[PDB]
Design a protein around this ligand. Structure first.
Ligand SMILES: [Ca+2]
Ligand SMILES: [Ca+2]
Ligand SMILES: [Ca+2]
Ligand SMILES: [Ca+2]
Lengths: 76, 76
């Protein structure tokens, strides 16, 4: 549905709301998605997004180096 | 409290189960988390992990260049 040029507009609109007007805080990302793409977060799974966050080179595997980003999250 | 040596042993135990024995697939990561850190996925939100995936330099702001990762996933 949306084009990449539209998405540039969208990024600029919501990034200007608070703080640095050229960058998106977590609160502005939440408002962007709730307003423009409200079904994006209910289709996503947390496990799938953690895996994408860890797998930086996109080979479908988490190496021991890449696992170090998960180790930072563990409470202890 | 888990030491660093213990976390290395956990990584190696679950990485060896399937396929490449030195790297973790998503199915092995699922088993590792359900067994060793069961509340971790329960406590995470999809939005929080999507933000962390996009915020590559960890300054808590997503720049337009960081945002492009999401643009390529949802737009043509
Ligand atoms: Ca902003
Ligand atoms: Ca990888
Ligand atoms: Ca493996
Ligand atoms: Ca950033």
């Amino acid at each position: 549905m949306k084009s990449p040029e539209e998405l540039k507009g969208i990024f600029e609109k919501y990034a200007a709301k608070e703080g640095d007007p050229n960058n998106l805080s977590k609160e502005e990302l939440k408002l962007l998605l709730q307003t423009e793409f409200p079904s994006l977060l209910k289709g996503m799974s947390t496990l799938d997004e953690l895996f994408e966050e860890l797998d930086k080179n996109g080979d479908g595997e988490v190496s021991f180096e890449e696992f170090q980003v998960l180790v930072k999250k563990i409470s202890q």
